[PDB]
Amino acid sequence: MYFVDRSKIEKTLGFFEHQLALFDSQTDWQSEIGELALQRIGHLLIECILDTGNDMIDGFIMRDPGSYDDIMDILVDEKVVTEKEGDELKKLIAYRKTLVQQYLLADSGELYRLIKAHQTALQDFPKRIRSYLETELGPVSAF
Amino acid sequence: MYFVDRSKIEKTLGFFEHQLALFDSQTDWQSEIGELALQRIGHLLIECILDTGNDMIDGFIMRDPGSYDDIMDILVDEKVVTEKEGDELKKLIAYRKTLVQQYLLADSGELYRLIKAHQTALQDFPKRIRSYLETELGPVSAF
Numbered sequence: 001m002y003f004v005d006r007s008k009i010e011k012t013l014g015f016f017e018h019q020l021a022l023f024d025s026q027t028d029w030q031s032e033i034g035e036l037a038l039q040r041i042g043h044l045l046i047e048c049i050l051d052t053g054n055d056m057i058d059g060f061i062m063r064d065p066g067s068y069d070d071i072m073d074i075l076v077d078e079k080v081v082t083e084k085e086g087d088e089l090k091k092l093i094a095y096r097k098t099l100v101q102q103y104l105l106a107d108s109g110e111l112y113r114l115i116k117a118h119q120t121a122l123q124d125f126p127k128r129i130r131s132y133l134e135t136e137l138g139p140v141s142a143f
Numbered sequence: 144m145y146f147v148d149r150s151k152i153e154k155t156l157g158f159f160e161h162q163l164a165l166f167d168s169q170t171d172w173q174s175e176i177g178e179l180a181l182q183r184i185g186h187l188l189i190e191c192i193l194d195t196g197n198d199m200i201d202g203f204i205m206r207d208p209g210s211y212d213d214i215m216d217i218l219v220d221e222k223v224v225t226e227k228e229g230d231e232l233k234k235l236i237a238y239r240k241t242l243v244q245q246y247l248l249a250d251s252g253e254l255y256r257l258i259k260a261h262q263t264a265l266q267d268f269p270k271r272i273r274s275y276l277e278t279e280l281g282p283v284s285a286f
Binding site for chain 2: 019022032034036040044104
């Protein structure tokens, strides 16, 4: 019934958690080098959420997203994450265009505050995904 | 005849030179934070080249690209950069997919080697662009 790219998802969740751990580390984000590292972390956190969300939606025959911005709303509808978690994650996702397209405008202090403000929802995201996977597919299989 | 986004190009070159100068520093790019910073730098350098390329092509009514490889090839065709500079920059641009899409596979050691190998072509890129702008538009005007 469901063909879920579980290897890809669980891979990307591990990667995500590593980057979050690094965010929670004792850096100097105010460095030059610190600013650049924080931009990469922000970009990676966002991409991992979007990619995982797409893989979830495709695998579990959820409503198709019109744009990457619709992904969280669908995960909320499907009770993958809470409404409040979804709204919080959306606020970080809204930074994507600045990071990838309007990069002259990227502001690492702003981005720090954004990630910090939603750190609990970020930490919980892999847990939500894994619980859903375990509930729907069991402990081992992608199908 | 030509309406070129010279202010966008010039500000983009400035930002590019700034990131390139951060690369040529005494920094440990192998640390967890350093690795992330270098990835951001690599991404930024690539995007600056492609965006400036696109702005040059649009402004000067050059051939419409159907590829990123095509952007550099068109700049070569139009005598903006040398054939060899074009080739060298395409080798860095070849890493974009890894940095932006297949980011689980990003290897900051591979990236360091890529940027180092083509450092001169990178340093000369803004010079090439400014020289073309000066010749075609004069020292002041965008049009």
